[PDB]
Amino acid sequence: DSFIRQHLRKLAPYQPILPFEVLSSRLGRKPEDIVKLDANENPYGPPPEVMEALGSIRFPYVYPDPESRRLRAALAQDSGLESEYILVGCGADELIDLIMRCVLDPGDKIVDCPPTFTMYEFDAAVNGALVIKVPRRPDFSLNVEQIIEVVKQEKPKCIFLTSPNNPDGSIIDDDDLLKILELPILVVLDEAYIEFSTIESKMSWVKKHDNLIVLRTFSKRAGLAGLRVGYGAFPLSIIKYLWRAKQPYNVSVAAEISACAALQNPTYLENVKDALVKERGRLFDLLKAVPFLKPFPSHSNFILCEVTSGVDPKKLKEDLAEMGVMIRHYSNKELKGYVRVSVGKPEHTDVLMNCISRLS
């Protein structure tokens, strides 16, 4: 019948997607003219040292350093955590997948707290794990009482927690995180958006908690989503096995060089973060004035809006796309009544608001 595992054959058929360069040409626009606010990308791009370095790669024909030593030394300086705790991956996506495949046997359970990042449930499915959903409360805070109860009853092995959360941008309180860390479970804290907040990274907590992992990325604030480079802080008892099991070469020389180059320009990284945090405030006020949008407070580089007044989030998203403006809408049941608008340049917000006005 088939060589493919039956569990994977039960996944929904792949729905092809047209690149935004294809939407661009279908609208008769240049790709750079699309206002792309649907993936939390940083439209300022990375510091100028990155493109200078990418254009002068001296050894493209040599395998990259599988230990990412240069970058891990730079991340140890950046984070204050010793490099022996730090692993680099081809995006934080690779590290989420690596953790699941190294921790979860077939049928093991993870806890998820929706609405949250869709890759946790996708990676659970492809890795043969079951998901226990413990929905967030109406203000998007964790229901810690329910997490404790399901963890005691069903004995899941892992819980993935995003802070600031995707898609609403709220943060997890220290006491809530510590309560969950008391449970016999591996806690993966995803700090993909932490730089847009004034909250300190918890990378250093892995020295005191051997059931905590903290994940970070260059994809968002550092403007390197296309290059695929992220990293995490891991307890020594975990990372010793991840070194043994990980693929050697998924992090390309272009990823290594770009991340190192980005860290050479802290002024640029601070300034672009400050520009996006400032625009987040302006965008919030502008969305709040739209009669059919109810934005939520956010510590990230995006704003979630409840769509009200009988307006359909899918039609709104499709109408904006026809005008050359991309925002995020949701197919799943937990998020079908919302849209998520990423923070871009002020000019991007202006185009978005002008298009919303024309649709209102």
Residues that bind Na ion (CB under 5 A): 288, 290, 293
Cis preceding linkage at 64, omega within 30: no
The residue (of 208 and 244) whose beta carbon lies closer to its own copies is 244
Compose the 153-192 pattern: x for residues touching its own copies by CB under 8 A, - for all others. ----xx---------------------------x------
CB 38 within 8 A of CB 342: yes
Give, for 77, the enclosing helix (H) or strand (E). helix 69-79
Q: How far is the CB of 234 from its own copies (least distance, A)?
A: 11
Partner in contact with 16, chosen from Na ion, its own copies, none, beta carbon below 5 to 8 Å by kind: its own copies
Distance CA 348, CA 103 (A): 42
Partner in contact with 303, chosen from Na ion, its own copies, none, beta carbon below 5 to 8 Å by kind: none
Burial of residue 78 (CB within 10 Å: 0-12, 13-18, 19+) is middle
- Out of 72, 88, 94, 164, the residue judged to bind its own copies by CB under 8 A: 94
Residue showing tokens 């992090």: 251
Q: How far is the CB of 357 from its own copies (least distance, A)?
A: 27
Partner in contact with 236, chosen from Na ion, its own copies, none, beta carbon below 5 to 8 Å by kind: none
Q: How far is the CB of 237 from its own copies (least distance, A)?
A: 7
The residue (of 46 and 295) whose beta carbon lies closer to its own copies is 46
Give all strands (DSSP E) within the chain, no chain letters: 35-36, 86-89, 109-112, 130-133, 158-162, 186-190, 212-217, 230-233, 293-295, 302-307, 325-326, 328-329, 338-342
Distance CA 138, CA 263 (A): 38
- Which part of the chain contacts its own copies (CB under 8 A), choosing from 8-16, 72-80, 166-174, 263-271? 8-16
CB 35 within 8 A of CB 344: yes
Q: Which residues inside 237-296 make contact with its own copies, applying CB under 8 A?
A: 237-238, 240-241, 243-245, 247-255, 258
User: Residue type at 109?
Assistant: K
Q: How far is the CB of 54 from its own copies (least distance, A)?
A: 5
The residue (of 122 and 292) whose beta carbon lies closer to its own copies is 122
Q: Which residues inside 120-139 make contact with its own copies, applying CB under 8 A?
A: 126
Q: Which residues inside 31-70 make contact with its own copies, applying CB under 8 A?
A: 31-32, 36, 39, 41-46, 50-51, 54-67, 69-70
Asked whether position 204 contacts its own copies by CB under 8 A, the answer is: no
Partner in contact with 104, chosen from Na ion, its own copies, none, beta carbon below 5 to 8 Å by kind: its own copies
Partner in contact with 313, chosen from Na ion, its own copies, none, beta carbon below 5 to 8 Å by kind: none
Partner in contact with 61, chosen from Na ion, its own copies, none, beta carbon below 5 to 8 Å by kind: its own copies
User: Residue type at 223?
Assistant: G
The DSSP annotation for 298-328 comes to: -SSSEEEEEE-TT--HHHHHHHHHHTTEE-E
Q: In this structure, what token pair is assigned to residue 242?
A: 């991840």
Q: How far is the CB of 288 from Na ion (least distance, A)?
A: 5
Compose the 219-248 pattern: x for residues touching its own copies by CB under 8 A, - for all others. x---xxxxxx--------xx-xx-xxx-xx
Decide the pairing of beta strands 325-326 and 35-36.
parallel
Q: How far is the CB of 333 from its own copies (least distance, A)?
A: 20
Distance CA 24, CA 33 (A): 8
Distance CA 45, CA 262 (A): 10
Q: Count of residues binding its own copies (CB under 8 A)?
A: 83
